[PDB]
Design an enzyme around this catalytic site. Structure first.
Site, mmCIF file in Angstrom:
data_model
loop_
_atom_site.group_PDB
_atom_site.id
_atom_site.type_symbol
_atom_site.label_atom_id
_atom_site.label_comp_id
_atom_site.label_asym_id
_atom_site.label_seq_id
_atom_site.Cartn_x
_atom_site.Cartn_y
_atom_site.Cartn_z
ATOM 1 N N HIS A 44 -26.357 14.654 22.883
ATOM 2 C CA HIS A 44 -26.045 14.426 24.278
ATOM 3 C C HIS A 44 -26.304 12.960 24.644
ATOM 4 C CE1 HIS A 44 -30.438 14.360 25.183
ATOM 5 N NE2 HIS A 44 -29.959 13.446 25.997
ATOM 6 N N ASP A 93 -28.343 20.176 19.943
ATOM 7 C CA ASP A 93 -28.411 18.807 20.419
ATOM 8 C C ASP A 93 -29.013 17.971 19.310
ATOM 9 O OD1 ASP A 93 -28.256 16.599 22.089
ATOM 10 O OD2 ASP A 93 -30.133 17.052 23.142
ATOM 11 N N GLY A 186 -34.750 8.815 29.045
ATOM 12 C CA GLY A 186 -34.895 7.632 28.216
ATOM 13 C C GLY A 186 -35.512 7.963 26.873
ATOM 14 N N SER A 188 -34.953 10.708 25.387
ATOM 15 C CA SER A 188 -33.976 11.541 24.698
ATOM 16 C C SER A 188 -33.650 10.970 23.321
ATOM 17 C CB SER A 188 -32.721 11.636 25.549
ATOM 18 O OG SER A 188 -32.979 12.544 26.588
ATOM 19 N N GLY A 189 -33.515 11.859 22.335
ATOM 20 C CA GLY A 189 -33.213 11.428 20.983
ATOM 21 C C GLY A 189 -34.487 11.063 20.260
#
Length: 237
Positions: A44, A93, A186, A188-189
């Site tokens: 995402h 994801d 922020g 994320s990942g």
């Protein structure tokens, strides 16, 4: 990262900051080095990204301030999104970034070991969440890499906190019943590092949550172990 503190330089050598150059350069997401040419991150995180050409991966970074026009970086050759991914909240994801050049390992940058199938029963000792994400709702990318220790919660427990959602076994949550510490926009990942026997493990990938650090609203992460086969298949030439 909410309720966290400044990380020590080189403390999380597998953590990378993924930037986008459009319109102007800025931090986009977090990621984890898992191979000399592979970054594991969230799918995402590429919403609105038509080309890997605008991506830039920086390793061995503590402070965003270190990143300037003359700072070396890794170009992205290819973005690999799981074919079953539709949206963060639904699962899958996960994504692979194939760099244009290989990473030369060093104390500032090295790969994190992927969990093994024979570790799903392993009670992760201590899990740390890290990133340059928001320290609160409606904030801004932080300069210094933040870290926060956060316990994992059972899937059954997480489901209770997310009625309306389907928390599958390919997901894993972490958080305090009372909130206070959590990932945020922020991060994320980013990786959800867990110390298995003095050995670090990439247990989860920062994916989503309702708000940030709210009480009874655990952070939701991709359950990496459920994708070791996928990862192997996608990384083999």
């Amino acid at each position: 990262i909410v309720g966290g503190t400044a990380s020590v330089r080189g403390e999380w050598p597998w953590q990378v900051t993924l930037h986008t150059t459009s319109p102007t350069q800025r931090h986009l997401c977090g990621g984890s080095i898992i191979g000399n040419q592979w970054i594991l991150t969230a799918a995402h995180c590429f919403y609105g990204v038509e080309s890997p050409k605008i991506l830039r991966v920086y390793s061995g970074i503590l402070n965003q301030a270190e990143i300037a026009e003359d700072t070396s970086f890794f170009g992205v050759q290819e973005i690999i999104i799981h074919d079953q991914y539709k949206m963060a909240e639904s699962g899958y994801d996960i994504a692979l970034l194939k760099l244009e050049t290989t990473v030369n390992y060093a104390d500032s940058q090295r790969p994190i070991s992927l969990p093994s199938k024979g570790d799903r029963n392993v009670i992760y000792t201590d899990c740390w969440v890290t990133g340059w994400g928001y320290r609160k709702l409606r904030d801004k990318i932080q300069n210094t890499l933040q870290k926060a220790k956060i316990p994992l919660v059972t899937n059954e427990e997480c489901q209770k906190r997310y009625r309306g959602h389907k928390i599958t076994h390919k997901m894993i949550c972490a958080g305090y019943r009372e909130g206070g510490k959590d990932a945020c926009k922020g991060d994320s990942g980013g990786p959800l590092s867990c110390k298995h026997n003095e050995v670090w493990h990439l247990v989860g990938i920062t994916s989503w949550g309702e708000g940030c650090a709210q009480r009874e609203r655990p952070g939701v992460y991709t359950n990496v172990v459920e994708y070791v086969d996928w990862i192997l298949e996608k990384t083999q030439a």
